[PDB]
Amino acid sequence: GPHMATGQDRVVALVDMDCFFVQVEQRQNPHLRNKPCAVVQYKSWKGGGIIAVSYEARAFGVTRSMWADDAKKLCPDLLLAQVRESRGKANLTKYREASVEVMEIMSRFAVIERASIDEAYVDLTSAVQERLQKLQGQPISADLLPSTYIEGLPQGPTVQKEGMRKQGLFQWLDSLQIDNLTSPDLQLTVGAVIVEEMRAAIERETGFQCSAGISHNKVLAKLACGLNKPNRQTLVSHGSVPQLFSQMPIRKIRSLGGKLGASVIEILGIEYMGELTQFTESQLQSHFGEKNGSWLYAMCRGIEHDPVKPRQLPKTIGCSKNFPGKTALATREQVQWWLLQLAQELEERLTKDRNDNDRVATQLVVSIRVQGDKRLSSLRRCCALTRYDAHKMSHDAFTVIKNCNTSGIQTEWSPPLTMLFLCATKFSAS
DNA sequence: ATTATGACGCT
DNA sequence: AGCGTCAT
Numbered sequence: 423g424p425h426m427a428t429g430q431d432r433v434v435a436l437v438d439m440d441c442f443f444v445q446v447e448q449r450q451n452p453h454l455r456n457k458p459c460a461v462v463q464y465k466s467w468k469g470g471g472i473i474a475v476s477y478e479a480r481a482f483g484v485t486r487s488m489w490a491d492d493a494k495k496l497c498p499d500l501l502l503a504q505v506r507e508s509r510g511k512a513n514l515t516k517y518r519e520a521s522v523e524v525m526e527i528m529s530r531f532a533v534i535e536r537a538s539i540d541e542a543y544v545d546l547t548s549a550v551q552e553r554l555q556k557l558q559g560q561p562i563s564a565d566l567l568p569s570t571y572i573e574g575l576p577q578g579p580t581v582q583k584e585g586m587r588k589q590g591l592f593q594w595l596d597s598l599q600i601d602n603l604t605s606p607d608l609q610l611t612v613g614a615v616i617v618e619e620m621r622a623a624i625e626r627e628t629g630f631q632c633s634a635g636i637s638h639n640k641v642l643a644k645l646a647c648g649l650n651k652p653n654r655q656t657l658v659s660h661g662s663v664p665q666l667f668s669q670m671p672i673r674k675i676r677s678l679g680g681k682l683g684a685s686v687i688e689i690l691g692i693e694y695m696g697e698l699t700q701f702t703e704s705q706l707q708s709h710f711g712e713k714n715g716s717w718l719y720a721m722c723r724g725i726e727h728d729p730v731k732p733r734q735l736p737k738t739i740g741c742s743k744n745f746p747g748k749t750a751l752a753t754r755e756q757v758q759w760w761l762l763q764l765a766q767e768l769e770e771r772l773t774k775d776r777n778d779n780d781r782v783a784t785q786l787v788v789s790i791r792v793q794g795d796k797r798l799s800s801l802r803r804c805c806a807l808t809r810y811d812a813h814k815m816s817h818d819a820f821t822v823i824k825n826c827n828t829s830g831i832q833t834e835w836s837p838p839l840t841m842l843f844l845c846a847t848k849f850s851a852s
Numbered sequence: 853a854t855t856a857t858g859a860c861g862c863t
Numbered sequence: 864a865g866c867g868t869c870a871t
């Protein structure tokens with residue numbers, strides 16, 4: 423009872439940009455705004471592969487991983503923007519720079535953890551304590567939460583979406599105890615006020631809209647963020663977890679969408695996250711290992727301890743290209759030329775990183791895939807990265823992979839390469 | 853012939 | 864160190 427810690431110590435937010443690459447292209451080209459729009463990589467094969475989709479286009483069934491030609495079948499007026507091509511490959515620099523814009527705004531409010539190109543976690547615990555001090559026990563007006571949903575409300579005792587949103591927010595605010603500066607529900611609420619301000623700042627200063635989740639840990643904040651996209655934020659309280667999880671497929675929780683989640687379902691004979699509560703911690707550890715078992719035991723009760731890492735910058739800088747089917751690299755000249763192309767992009771990005779961020783990478787990782795191997799990587803080899811020079815990096819990458827070529831002929835490469843990947847790692851302050 | 857990235861756990 | 868998983 424009283425000693426049963428409930429995982430309510432922290433206020434954590436997850437901010438995710440809506441259809442990010444599409445918004446980057448819509449800002450640059452106003453003709454794409456408020457239209458069914460998607461971003462594609464390449465064009466020759468089936469129109470290019472879609473990697474981002476505006477919400478207008480999603481209404482027609484357009485999705486990521488779809489070929490543009492098939493997307494056009496579902497939505498003939500779909501507009502398309504293509505990723506830049508440089509040195510023969512897709513170049514994502516425009517989106518990385520737009521990402522830095524958003525991350526720097528978020529960092530004004532709190533230290534953030536960059537989780538991907540378009541989303542970051544925020545630990546708002548201290549910021550919430552400060553705003554609570556300033557409030558002096560003043561209640562929180564619904565006017566301060568103009569885009570916030572309270573998951574699970576309204577309940578009990580109505581036709582429009584905004585009306586439902588405001589109804590739930592009213593029930594939530596009416597139930598709040600604002601004289602208690604340590605009430606977790608109040609703390610989450612103040613956290614949501616701050617996230618409204620953060621999202622207002624992002625849209626004002628970049629033009630980009632985003633959604634957000636506010637809860638007590640990273641997994642619940644991420645799940646909350648997805649409940650009311652786009653351009654809205656969602657508060658998931660500790661109390662909302664039993665009902666939320668009672669019908670939540672296990673695969674919806676981050677890290678359970680793959681083989682481990684399928685094994686949870688198959689071994690335990692369950693479907694929903696809430697069903698996990700009926701097992702003891704030792705039972706879960708016996709099936710899924712000590713770490714996973716402890717994590718599942720806490721997480722099905724809404725509890726997770728993973729910290730928001732103080733990290734605004736990526737830990738690695740990498741360059742990769744697939745060479746599918748008949749485009750696979752089958753000569754040594756080919757392999758050297760593409761290693762050089764990747765290495766020149768890497769050099770450019772690394773040099774800009776050293777200038778911006780006062781650090782230098784010290785290890786080069788070379789990954790290849792060989793024809794007939796279904797795995798992502800057929801082989802990974804590291805070597806030293808001592809100079810930001812593309813010719814040196816590509817020569818070293820060739821040296822560490824050249825023993826892969828089973829061809830007796832010096833010129834041919836067998837079996838052909840269907841992927842090259844260069845990744846700079848192990849940064850040190852410079 | 854999804855592709856181009858990341859992060860992180862395991863041994 | 865090199866490999867596998869998860870994401871998207």
Ligand SMILES: Nc1nc2c(ncn2[C@H]2C[C@H](O)[C@@H](COP(=O)(O)NP(=O)(O)OP(=O)(O)O)O2)c(=O)[nH]1
Nearest residue numbers: 438439440441442443444473474475540855856871
């Ligand atoms: N190169 C590449 N980029 C990708 C891929 N998948 C996603 N991206 C890029 C394109 C995406 O714009 C961006 C962010 O990924 P999300 O947050 O998963 N999707 P979004 O922000 O579009 O929509 P939502 O409103 O549902 O959050 O990453 C991929 O497979 N390859």
Ligand SMILES: [Mn+2]
Nearest residue numbers: 438439440540
């Ligand atoms: Mn997004």
Ligand SMILES: [Mn+2]
Nearest residue numbers: 438538540541
């Ligand atoms: Mn994202």
